[PDB]
């Protein structure tokens, strides 16, 4: 399952 | 009425921080880490990404809150505490620590850390 993030500090998201 | 499973893993926190030569990662404030019916929470995450492997990264969280929690339609609530937890991408191993403790129909444990696997 892959990994996923959503950053608060910018307003946009990431795969890593 | 959904799977866990099938969705992928969504997170978030307030600090993020990577280095590509450090091959490590940190997220700092009450992250919050879901799949479907599965909800885990810590304030960090480690991770290293060697590369050259693909899907063998892990992801060991600590701080506190340090629960779990999951919701089944199948009449079946799991919930957990711990200092310390190891989770994982497909099944590679699986352990809570520090004050361990977990609670389902059939299943009732507690101690230093619990034993089971994804």
Redesign the interface.
């Known amino acids: ?9 910018t307003x946009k998201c990431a795969r ?1 | 009425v959904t799977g866990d499973t099938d969705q992928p893993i969504h997170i978030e926190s307030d600090q993020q921080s990577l280095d590509m030569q450090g091959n490590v990662v940190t997220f700092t404030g009450n992250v919050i880490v879901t799949q479907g019916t599965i909800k885990i929470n810590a304030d960090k995450v480690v991770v290293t990404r060697p590369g050259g492997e693909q899907g063998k990264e892990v992801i060991d969280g600590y701080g506190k809150p340090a629960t779990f929690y999951q919701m089944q339609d199948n009449g079946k609530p799991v919930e957990g505490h711990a200092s310390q937890m190891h989770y994982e991408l497909a099944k590679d191993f699986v352990v809570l620590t520090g004050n361990a403790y977990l609670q389902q129909v059939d299943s009732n444990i507690k101690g230093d850390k619990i034993t089971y696997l994804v």
């Open positions: 399952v892959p990994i996923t993030y959503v950053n608060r500090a890593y």
